[PDB]
Nucleic acid binder design. Sequence first.
RNA 1: AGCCAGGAUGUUGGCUUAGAAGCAGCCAUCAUUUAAAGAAAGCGUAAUAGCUCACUGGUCGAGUCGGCCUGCGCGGAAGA
RNA 2: CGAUGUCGGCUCAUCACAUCCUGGGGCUGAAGUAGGUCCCAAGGGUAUGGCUGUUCGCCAUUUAAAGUGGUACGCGAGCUG
RNA 3: AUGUAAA
RNA 4: GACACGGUCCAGACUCCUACGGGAGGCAGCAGUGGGGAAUAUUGCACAAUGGGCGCAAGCCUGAUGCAGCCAUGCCGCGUG
RNA 5: CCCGCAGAAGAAGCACCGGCUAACUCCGUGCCAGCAGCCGCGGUAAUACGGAGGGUGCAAGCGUUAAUCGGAAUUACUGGG
RNA 6: CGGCCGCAAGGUUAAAACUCAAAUGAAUUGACGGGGGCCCGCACAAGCGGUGGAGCAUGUGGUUUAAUUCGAUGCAACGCGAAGAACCUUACCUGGUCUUGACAUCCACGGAAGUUUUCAGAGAUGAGAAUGUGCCUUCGGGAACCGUGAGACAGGUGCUGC
RNA 7: CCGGCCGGGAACUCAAAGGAGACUGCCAGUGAUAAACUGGAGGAAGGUGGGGAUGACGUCAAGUCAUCAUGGCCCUUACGACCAGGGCUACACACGUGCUACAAUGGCGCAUACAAAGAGAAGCGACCUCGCGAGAGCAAGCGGACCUCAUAAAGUGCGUCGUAGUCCGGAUUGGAGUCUGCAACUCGACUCCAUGAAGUCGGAAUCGCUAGUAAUCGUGGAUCAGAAUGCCACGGUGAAUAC
RNA 8: CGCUUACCACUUUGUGAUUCAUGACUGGGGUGAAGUCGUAACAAGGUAACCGUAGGGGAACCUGCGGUUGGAUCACCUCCU
RNA 9: CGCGGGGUGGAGCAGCCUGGUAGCUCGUCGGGCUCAUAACCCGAAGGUCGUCGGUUCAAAUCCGGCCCCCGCAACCA
Length: 348
Amino acid sequence: SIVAKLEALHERHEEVQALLGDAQTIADQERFRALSREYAQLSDVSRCFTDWQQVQEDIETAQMMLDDPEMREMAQDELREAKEKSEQLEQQLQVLLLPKDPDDERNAFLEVRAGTGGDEAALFAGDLFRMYSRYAEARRWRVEIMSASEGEHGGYKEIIAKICGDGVYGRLKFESGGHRVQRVPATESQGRIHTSACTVAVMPELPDAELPDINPADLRIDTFRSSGAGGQHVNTTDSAIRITHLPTGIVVECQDERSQHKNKAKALSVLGARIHAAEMAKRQQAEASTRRNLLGSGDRSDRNRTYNFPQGRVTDHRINLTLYRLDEVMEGKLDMLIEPIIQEHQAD
RNA sequence: AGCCAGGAUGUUGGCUUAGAAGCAGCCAUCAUUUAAAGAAAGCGUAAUAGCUCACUGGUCGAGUCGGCCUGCGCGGAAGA
RNA sequence: CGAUGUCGGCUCAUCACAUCCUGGGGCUGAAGUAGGUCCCAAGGGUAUGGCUGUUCGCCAUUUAAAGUGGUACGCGAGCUG
RNA sequence: AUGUAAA
RNA sequence: GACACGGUCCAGACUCCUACGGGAGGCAGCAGUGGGGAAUAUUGCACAAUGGGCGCAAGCCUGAUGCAGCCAUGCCGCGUG
RNA sequence: CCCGCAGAAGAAGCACCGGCUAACUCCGUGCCAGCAGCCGCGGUAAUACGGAGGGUGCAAGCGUUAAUCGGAAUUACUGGG
RNA sequence: CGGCCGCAAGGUUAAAACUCAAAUGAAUUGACGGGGGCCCGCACAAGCGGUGGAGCAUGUGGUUUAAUUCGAUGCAACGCGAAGAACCUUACCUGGUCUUGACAUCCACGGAAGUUUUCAGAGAUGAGAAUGUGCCUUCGGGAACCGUGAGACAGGUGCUGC
RNA sequence: CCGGCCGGGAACUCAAAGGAGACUGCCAGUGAUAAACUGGAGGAAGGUGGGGAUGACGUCAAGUCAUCAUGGCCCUUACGACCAGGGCUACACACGUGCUACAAUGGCGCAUACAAAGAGAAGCGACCUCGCGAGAGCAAGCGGACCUCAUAAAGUGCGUCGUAGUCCGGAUUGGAGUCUGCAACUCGACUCCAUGAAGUCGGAAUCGCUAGUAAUCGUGGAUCAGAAUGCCACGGUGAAUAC
RNA sequence: CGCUUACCACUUUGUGAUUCAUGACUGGGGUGAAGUCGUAACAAGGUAACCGUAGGGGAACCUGCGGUUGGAUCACCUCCU
RNA sequence: CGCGGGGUGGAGCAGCCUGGUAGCUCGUCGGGCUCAUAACCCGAAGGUCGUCGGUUCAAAUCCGGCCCCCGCAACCA
């Protein structure tokens, strides 16, 4: 848990403090950033671990020390100090679990898609839109339906939705993946628990900085004679333009009309169109290569979250939580699942 | 104008505690000792340290330093 | 418009330097080699094949280099078409 | 017409 | 008694020497090495015994053999009370 | 091969445990981690996965893999339709 | 694929790689037939009075909120559990409190139990003042009641009708 | 003082027990002279007279561990325990079940006749008085075939209303109130005044019924300090159709 | 000894057969816990099915011709031997 | 900016030419039919015709003015 992670951070702090005084390292800036993280973490760690060790010692020694009353009063004072130290350790964990980075402040795109069992997925994906809308209206987030493909017996097959504000992606990072469904559904007559799955993609903003300059100082413009037919004038004059980019290597050849300025206009518009095509193709490949890594095949396999409905259990594969509610979870209030994953993900 | 000197103690200053410390960027751009010193114009350091100028002394000892109005010039001014 | 034959190719070249190489120097973020940039200097040299009629371009391999242009973007009373 | 998978 | 393992010549492939005129070589022997592969051994002792070759015989050679070393590869037996 | 010295002293592992086929429970996950020669288990009360205990089988060997035959009269001449 | 035949469509002969522990044949018992025969029920036919159009009462779904407690949710849930929510009931929420406890038992110590009344507080409670001081005497003790301390535990209308 | 009020009786109504009777008992026809069917006579009741209870092996892995018990899981300075307030009654929408209606076989006012089944003591609460009223003050009888709830209503006579959203219907609202409870504001019931909407017979579609049923009308009880149109139970009038 | 003829190996040229990998592209085959559309076959499967052949259609498939029951119904017609 | 097509339920179209009326398909919501879905049926909402001005008894229409999407914009013998 966090105690096994804090010890490795304290050992890395004690190693970096010894390596800093050895004076054998030329580069020191990354070592100074590591020492800054060490001064942020290991001081509160050495406070909280020593306070918890002294509290556990003063409790376990005075609990069975021949049933004394003065040792019991000393253990009560140590328990008050233990409550103060536990509040200080919770404040230190809340300070260490803070999203300082400005990439966490960005908006997001949620893509809830159906997996196994279409009818079940539709019921489930519509309820997950309901689940994150309930979650989103609690903190006052804006929910806009960008695209929603309907199912058969209700729900939706694919939902792509923008959520805007201040800090959507940094709070909803850990939701890309699969979701189990164990339910007794409304579409099933028999009444046997079934397994259904749904896949959720979480995408960041990535704001469009499009249309770089054409850079006529970087354009190589070759004005040479044209091939073909038509007149004496074509032979005398060039009437053909080839423009090549230096940083991308895009070549556009125009031999269309008589005047070169109509040809100049086409030989710049095709450059702009091919720049826009080659940049939007790379952007759509960068979207797809991340979506195929976040969204799996869609099967019933374990992908980080398992939800149990007839037993009353919510068990995730990372940070094995055992919350037996399923009623304060179905109507917003997803703090207890999301927060400790952040707390022991920012420990690394 | 040259020549023998000075050109300080806290300023590791609070700053985003990784450091910006007279000199990346913030603002404050203090005050003493005072022949004189801007908490700094430049060089050099991860930051220091260090090196000059600002300015003040002394030898020296007669004119010198910087802007403005114009006339004629200089360069930019390279072809078959 | 009572006539100046134009493109590309072969041969033949001439001239300017806004110099591709060779030559002499300055700065460098020039340890040496190999470099980047600037000045003077035209004395000499400044490719071979595939494609395309193509000038040009790409490729393959050399070279110290595969210079830019003018001369009716040279040259048909020198030659094809 | 349809009623996807777990005795 | 071979149209010839440790004989000859010619033609071809591969290593080595050369003073470049030309030559040496053929572990599908025992050992041992590279390569292949999941996979397989020691560059050991001696003719003490047999057998083969030569010699009248004594004697000589024998990586066949008689063994020794390694591998639980297979079988058998014993112990770990 | 025989005698003497000393001290239980130096010498026990491998597979399996639902049926075929020899042997039972507990804990940890939870159609996941995984096992498996076939039927097949694991979906929060697992005699099947992992760990512990116990038992079973074989023994300096034990399991897996690869090949042949039998079972297979499922190549039928013995011995099918 | 190959060989042969044919004007062609194509026909004849005839594999291999790969996948699975099933495929198929007859037959029994249930299920069903918009298959047949027979029989029954306000099932159809005929009629009566209704619902759905309006207002009110109740319950549910959905929405909102601190909860709008939980279960039932096709016939077989929806004036259902509830044969009756102002507090109580209440299992829900907000706020203030108690933890061997509100309730069951064991040990040690102290005290008749009880009654009246006052102060602060939303009240639980906290802090008091008087009165009463027996049923058997091993009389260091009893048979009940009350308060304190520790462990066994208690408690749960928390989950699972799968 | 005609009130079964008092004598007086065990006939009769009512009432409780024990029995009788109704069991295809008999006849005629038909049917295999068998089971059985139809019709007829007696009878109050014809062929299980009528109704209720009594629910076959099994199906729905149908519901309840929230009535209870219980395996195992969990909390055990808490998800356990107590207190005050709020909520379970909130509301842009939809559905289910019932009541009141949309009127003239009907409304209003006066007079008047006929019930069964029940409940009652930290209860029913006569009679008298006051209040338009819900109820209040005083206070018998009864743990009961006597006492109380308790005047039954539709039904009948008479007068009015003339087919209009009107004298139908009664939602909602304001004021003054009454009962209970410690407290009626969220969030009880009832009465008076005043207002008095939608609704003029209902789209697609759908429900129950074959007899004292359908429909209509009233009463009582369980729950309960107070709080039903719901549930249970009783009674009055009472059809039509079944080829 | 040299010469020359006959046999003749390595090698070279020309043209075929067979086989192994590779080859842009294309067709069909087997696998998928979830796909889109249709319901073609199993009851008379709601147009009875199957086979051969020709044509058509996004697709199970449809239509015509020939064969077979590996098909139900035959208390609905009326009258009957 | 110059030219044209235009701006009719949430979306397509009639209806403008040639004025006496806001209409029809699709879609949305709700209820039925079925154990449930599809199909089918019923009911409701939805535009004042892109906006404004003028003629007319009457402008969705006839005409004109101002804003918004779309396509074109200097070529060839």
